[PDB]
Symmetry: C3
Subunit: 332 residues, 3 copies
């Protein structure tokens, strides 16, 4: 036999009242599908003659091997966005603008404005502290090979009249010179000074100097001729003082050189020699000594003579003259 | 006809011995599915009357377009976790705490403790090296407008007695003053000094000074009256020395002023003038000159007179007196 | 009945000319599947007797819940690769090599080579600017407790002969000493100096000093015996000058001490005292005073006597002698 089954379009069955007997097959002509009845339900409620369940399929894929939207998002949440992170290059770029501890080159100004913890006292104080105890190099080196400038190499300035510290303070222990100033014998000459000092304070000495030398001068001044010409430096002097009055003032009464010995000295107060030969000196007691002929454009007030080599007085002459006068006048 | 087929529950077939002929259909009443026999196999081993193969389905999805767990994880492995990376903000935060090469403001102390490569010698040495050869600004500028402080602006200190370098060393070439110290004429006066120097070393001069001036003083001291009152500075002096003994000592024999010329000079060793007029001077040979009347509270030991204007001696008077005595005494 | 259907292998149907009537079932013996005809199409073009449409399956999975390759890649594109980002550790590593503004420790050299904006003038200039107006600490502190070294603590050097600024410049307002130099009384003695100054410039004074003291010395020199032995410092002096010629030169004519008062002074130009007692002095007018007996190894040229206590001249003696001679000679 060639069996044919109850048949009509899917659309047609869906509204038909035909009840297929149990296991009787129904055929959807427009789809080609079929359904079997259970003897009581209408076509549209029967099920197809073969499974339609995903769990029953063969060759299914690996669904569990696939990533879920949620799963991925959770993981992506832990990852850093490009926009909120610097690239190694950008980091390098910003780091190269910073100074290394190992050292570097500043091209701008470095200002110091200390909060000041307590800023100490002694060998660990200072905005800038340099300890050279373990190296043999220099501490601060400042130089200029420029033809001119509008400022000094180093400048120290205090402002208040109550400032109770020093500008510069040197505590020195060693075998050489503490402060060494050397003004190179210039090329284009100038009328300057190696060290220039000015004080407007009237109650304190411009410069104070105390030494405890055994066989030297506290202050040793040495002038050396700048020429080989015997009398080139005939205007020079090792030490020249000037006592001058004030700007539109009335005058001055200051003294030139004041020598004193508050505790009493034994030596000579003023000793003047040439080629290491005493030529003039003022002993500690006041008596002076002069090696060569001298001159006074005035009179000399002194004690009468007692020795044959003493300068004689008017009174001494007039007395000897008078006595001779009396002596001689006997007459006849 | 209304064909009905061999039928029983899925559970029932699974254990039945009924062998469906080839192509004969079997019907599962509780599921509604059917299977056709191959003429030898039991129901449970037949297959459904329609495919159950995922590869055969229509409208399948895009399985290959879906991401695999493995695939994603491999990619996520290359990505940087949030927890192990600084955000641009955090980076900025840490970078702003660092000093720029362009310059900045230090608010704390900067200590230097040089490893010391060799720390050089000359114009590239120093923990801090400042080269002002191409700019016109200052090098180191240190100032304080505070009313007081517990420390100095700049302090240099060496510790060992064998230290063979100087605290401060100035090598100067230029047209102005190498070191310029200026102590402003104070407001609240003090009994200080612009420059104060003290040496405890007995084998070396407190201060050494050498110059090669053509027409000046190596050391030029100038005192200017602080007042317009003619005799306000009657106690002052340009230069005052003091020769004092030690703490609970026995005395001192030091000399005040020592002038010498080891190579022999032509000039005047001591020249004292007023208004640029010679008033007193000690020639190079020792002879002195005095412009006005003088006084000696004692005797003067000198050579006999040869000129009519020479101070005469005792011996000269007594001789002329004696000769006149003899001369006169003839008598009768 | 036991119905059997038209049947043959899938391979066999695919090339058969058999036309199954509408709803007549065909059976693939090698697969076990079946197809129903539509009365005109060949077997291979009929469809299976049950759906094969993914949309129709039950228990489908959550396909939309799965992540797409595209979707993931787009998201991963925003994330930062490990290879192009520094880890917090690497960042810390590089940041710890940089100096903090709060301060730190330099272990290398810090060079300054100012672009120089204009580098100012006054209290904000300098490569290094230190403002201590709000703290009581030190500014620059430089010390060395090393036994020796090959360089100085601080060194300033200018190169051109046209340099128109000073090496070091101190502007000081306060109650103490501007520059304070102290050379500790050495352990291993040396033949140095606290301050050593040398000038090769012939047109300017080695050292210039100006003060406006009311009752002091501009320059105050004090020598204190280093011993308690009364005559230990019998070679010393507070101030010793030396006038020397040049290297293989001809001689020198320089002067020792030059005292002048360009504006005219009232005081004593040279005052020498012992225990605060005048022993010798040269008045402003040139007349000198000597407390004790003196000596001249030569002659003294002076004015004739007018007072009984004036040193008498040759001429005065010879005149009084002559007058007595005439006077006496009357005879008989």
């Amino acid at each position: 036999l060639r069996v044919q089954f109850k048949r009509m379009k899917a659309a047609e069955w869906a509204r038909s009242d035909v009840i297929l007997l149990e296991s009787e097959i129904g055929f959807e002509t427009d789809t080609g599908f079929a359904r079997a009845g259970d003897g009581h339900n209408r076509f549209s409620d029967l099920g197809y003659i073969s499974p339609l369940d995903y769990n029953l399929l063969t060759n299914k894929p690996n669904i569990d091997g696939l990533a879920t939207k949620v799963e991925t998002a959770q993981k992506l949440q832990q990852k850093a966005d490009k926009e909120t992170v610097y690239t190694k290059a950008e980091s390098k770029q910003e780091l190269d603008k910073k100074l290394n501890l190992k050292g570097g080159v500043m091209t701008g100004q470095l200002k110091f404005k200390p909060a000041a913890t307590v800023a100490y006292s002694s060998s660990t104080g200072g905005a800038v502290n340099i300890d050279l105890s373990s190296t043999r190099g220099a501490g601060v080196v400042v130089y200029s090979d420029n033809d001119t400038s509008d400022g000094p190499l180093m400048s120290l300035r205090t402002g208040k009249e109550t400032f109770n510290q020093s500008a510069l303070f040197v505590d020195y222990k060693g075998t050489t010179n503490a402060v060494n100033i050397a003004m190179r014998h210039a090329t284009t000459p100038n009328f300057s000074s190696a060290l220039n000092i000015t004080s407007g304070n009237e109650n304190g000495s411009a410069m104070q100097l105390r030494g405890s030398e055994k066989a030297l001068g506290t202050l040793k001044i040495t002038h050396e001729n700048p020429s080989i010409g015997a009398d080139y430096d005939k205007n020079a002097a090792a030490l020249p003082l000037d006592l001058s009055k004030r700007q539109n003032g009335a005058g001055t009464a200051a003294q030139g050189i004041y020598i004193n010995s508050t505790s009493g000295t034994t030596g000579k107060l003023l000793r003047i020699r040439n080629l290491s030969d005493d030529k003039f000196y003022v002993k500690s007691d006041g008596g002076f000594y002069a090696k060569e002929t001298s001159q006074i454009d005035g009179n000399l007030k002194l004690k009468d003579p007692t020795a044959n080599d003493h300068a004689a007085t008017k009174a001494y002459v007039d007395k000897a003259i008078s006595e001779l006068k009396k002596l001689i006048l006997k007459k006849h």
